[PDB]
Amino acid sequence: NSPHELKNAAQRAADWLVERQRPNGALPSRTAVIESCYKGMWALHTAGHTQAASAVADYVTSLLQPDGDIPQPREERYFLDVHYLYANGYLTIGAHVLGRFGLSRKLMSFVETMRNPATGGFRSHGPAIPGDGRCDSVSTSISGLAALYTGRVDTARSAADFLGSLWVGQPDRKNVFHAVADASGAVLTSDDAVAVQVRKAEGDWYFIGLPAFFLTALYEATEDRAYLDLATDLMTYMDEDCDEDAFVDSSCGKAGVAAALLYRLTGRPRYREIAEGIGTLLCERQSPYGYWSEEETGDVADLFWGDLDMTAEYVLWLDLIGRNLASGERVWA
Amino acid sequence: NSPHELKNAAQRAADWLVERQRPNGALPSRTAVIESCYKGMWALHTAGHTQAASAVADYVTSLLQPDGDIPQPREERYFLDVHYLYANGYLTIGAHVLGRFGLSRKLMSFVETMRNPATGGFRSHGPAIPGDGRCDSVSTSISGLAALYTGRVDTARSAADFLGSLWVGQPDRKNVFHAVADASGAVLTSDDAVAVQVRKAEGDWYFIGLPAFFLTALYEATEDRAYLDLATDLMTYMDEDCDEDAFVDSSCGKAGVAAALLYRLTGRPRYREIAEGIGTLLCERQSPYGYWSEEETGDVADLFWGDLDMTAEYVLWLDLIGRNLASGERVWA
């Protein structure tokens, strides 16, 4: 409920991760893949576990290719041709806040090579992965957020132009959110493209919530009204037009951070309710042992990559929601 | 002390700061001045107290002038016409790692108006402070470091050019390190210019050790061997040519952070020894209650501004030394 309780829940999960961290810096995943620990540097840093976060940086650095990518180890389909750069985005942010300026420069440089200069979006499928050059809202939003942390504001602005075009070009937003555009910049409505079923409870809301977070952060960076209006449009869209699952599904953390940030920037109490309700909902789902999981309930020493990623992820969202609610209350009182 | 123990000493100092933080976000200083808490955002964030760090950001934001400076409250002469930008530099870094991108952009924008475009140095005295346009190695090094964290690498490279020219232009480096150049870039040997007596135990060593830290981070950011060679020439200068006080004085933490950083990058055991020794020395000076002080020993509720600055400063240095020694160990195992 309170920002102190969100933070305490995050510190427990971070303690759970650090106790089971491997000597090479990898987090306790049942499959050694990058999609199990890409949020690890940033998450452990915000929890104060700077030597554990630096150890993850040691692990990430040893996997780095000369071009700045980490193409292996990757197994999950979503980290191959859905949002390949989703891992690279958190890696860039986590490295930069740690002061690993060489790691973050190389990571962000590769992210830039995947930018579509015509549209501002970022390619969904990595190198040597079959695909048609499509660009999705998640790859674009996380790369734009990585652009903000590394000071590449023009890249972040161009990424917001993509999200603005993707929002206006929606053919039927009341029923479906097409989160992908083709290489020319047109909204991609192909069956094999990510499309959120908005009036239904089938998840994938972070294709809307992560753009809402990134756009609010970009507004804070620039105080350009257009980025605020688009972020509030996405929040209104998720609150009124979308199913109740938009703030219940496991991917609702992005929108919760966006609402917490929007509360500190605007003071509108509806954003505090969305942030508090989401942050509370993640606290209730936490295992007493510290981790989050879909199936596991016992005192396990490792998790499958999806649960381990979600655990480090909720460390970030609970910490971000907590400090923006705490500061928003101080500001607007 | 091991890296685990340096981090434990940092967490205790951060804990001490957080319990006494004022409702407005200010740290427990007996005088309300910016020089008492400018390292607060960065230090509290690295310790994991992200809500306390956000609170410092709110307090700092309430002081920010439209041009991005915080000229008041200031009282210490060193933050007026010796190294005025020393406070702004840590504020920029702390704001940026927190994701307060509006605060960090505005702070960095002002810092860059203080850059001398002909020399790459940053003016020692602030606006409306009497001065002649001199630039010092501390204002330049902390501004270059803030530029690295905000991703303005051209500014950092220019700051490095100033440090290299200041180093080559030393008229008597074995006796005195003149840390100040004039507006045209000539090394300033006037009596009113900062000058370190390198063969006496008279402090002010951070005019050499903070350039060494920044230049090491710039080398990590660019892998331009010129910045490594200059950083190593400054460490060798402090190790062999300079008095033992360069690694014992309260301002030695900068040299220790540079040594820890150089150990992870180069693996040379001498750098690990400098960082270990400086790290354990600061741990031994810590009070039982968690703060650092020059002459205070009781269970106090606040501190002299210089003691509070030192307390937040040793949170940073002990954490940075600890994480770089631990990661250097893993890398050079």
**H helical segments located in B98-180:** 101-113, 137-150, 153-168
DSSP string, A189-245: --TTS-EEETTTT---THHHHHHHHHHHHHHHHH--HHHHHHHHHHHHIIIIIS-GG
CA distance B89 to B306: 17
Structure tokens given for B53: 């760090």
DSSP string, A243-267: -GGGGTSGGGHHHHHHHHHHHHHH-
Query: Which of A227, A261, A322, A258 has the alpha carbon at shortest distance from B100?
Result: A261
The Cα of A6 is separated from the nearest Cα of chain B by a number of Å equal to 11
Task: Compare CB distances from A102 to B45, B48, B223 and report the shortest one's residue.
Answer: B223
Cα-based angle B317, B320, B321 (whole degrees, multiple of 5): 80
CA distance B273 to B259: 8
Query: How many pairs of residues across A and B have Cβ atoms under 8 Å apart?
Result: 109
CB atoms within 10 A of CB B76: 17
Residues 109-168 of B with CB under 8 A from A: 148-152
Instruction: Answer for the pair A238, A212: CB distance below 8 angstroms, yes or no.
Output: yes
Is there a contact between A55 and B327 if contact means CB atoms under 8 Å apart?
yes
Compare all CA atoms of chain B with the CA of A213 and give the residue at the minimum distance: B99
Helix (H) or strand (E) holding B274: helix B269-285
What angle separates helix B3-19 from helix B269-285, to the nearest 10 degrees?
40
Whether residue A5 lies within 8 A of chain B, CB to CB, comes out as no
Strands annotated E in chain B: 135-136, 176-178, 180-181, 195-197
Residue B4, burial from CB neighbour count under 10 angstroms (0-12, 13-18, 19+): exposed
Is there a contact between B57 and A330 if contact means CB atoms under 8 Å apart?
no
Method used to determine the 3D structure: X-ray
Helix (H) or strand (E) holding A160: helix A153-168
Contacts of A135 by beta carbon, 8 Å cutoff, 6+ apart: A116, A119, A121, A122, A123, A124, A162, A180, A181, A182, A183
Instruction: Answer for the pair B147, B153: CB distance below 8 angstroms, yes or no.
Output: yes
Is there a contact between A48 and B11 if contact means CB atoms under 8 Å apart?
yes
CA distance B163 to B172: 16
Is there a contact between A51 and B327 if contact means CB atoms under 8 Å apart?
yes
Structure tokens given for A25: 């810096």
Instruction: Answer for the pair B252, B210: CB distance below 8 angstroms, yes or no.
Output: no
CA distance B148 to B195: 27
CA distances from B304 to B74, B204, B245, B254 (A): 14, 19, 24, 21
3-state secondary structure of A177: strand
The Cα of A77 is separated from the nearest Cα of chain B by a number of Å equal to 30
CA distance A123 to A106: 18
Residues 8-37 of A with CB under 8 A from B: 11, 14, 23-25
The Cα of A168 is separated from the nearest Cα of chain B by a number of Å equal to 27
CA distance A94 to A38: 8
CA distance B103 to B95: 6
Task: Compare CB distances from A148 to B47, B101, B221 and report the shortest one's residue.
Answer: B101
Is there a contact between B221 and A55 if contact means CB atoms under 8 Å apart?
no
DSSP string, A62-113: HT--TTS---SS---GGGTTTSTHHHHHHHHHHHHHTT-HHHHHHHHHHHHH
Is there a contact between A323 and B50 if contact means CB atoms under 8 Å apart?
yes
Structure tokens given for A277: 């309700």
CA distance B48 to A15: 12
Is there a contact between B50 and A148 if contact means CB atoms under 8 Å apart?
no
Residue with tokens 């079959």: A130
Compare all CA atoms of chain A with the CA of B24 and give the residue at the minimum distance: A330
Is there a contact between A101 and B324 if contact means CB atoms under 8 Å apart?
no
Domains of chain B (ranges, CATH numbers): 3-331 (1.50.10.20)
Structure tokens given for B169: 């232009």
Instruction: Answer for the pair A142, A148: CB distance below 8 angstroms, yes or no.
Output: no
Task: Compare CB distances from B102 to A57, A150, A221 and report the shortest one's residue.
Answer: A221
Structure tokens given for B47: 């310790």
The Cα of A171 is separated from the nearest Cα of chain B by a number of Å equal to 34
CB-CB neighbors (< 8 A) of B160 in chain A: none
Task: Compare CB distances from B151 to A4, A151, A220 and report the shortest one's residue.
Answer: A151
Contacts of B303 by beta carbon, 8 Å cutoff, 6+ apart: B28, B29, B30, B291, B293, B296, B311
Task: Compare CB distances from A330 to B25, B102, B150 and report the shortest one's residue.
Answer: B25
CA distance B276 to B259: 9
Report the residue of A266, A320, A323 to disrupt the B interface, i.e. the one with the largest count of B CBs within 10 Å: A323
The Cα of B306 is separated from the nearest Cα of chain A by a number of Å equal to 25
CA distance A104 to A64: 11
CB-CB neighbors (< 8 A) of A152 in chain B: 151
Compare all CA atoms of chain A with the CA of B218 and give the residue at the minimum distance: A101
CA distance A93 to A107: 9
CB-CB neighbors (< 8 A) of B57 in chain A: 327
3-state secondary structure of A122: strand
Which resolution, in Å, applies to this structure?
A: 2.2
CA distance B311 to B10: 9
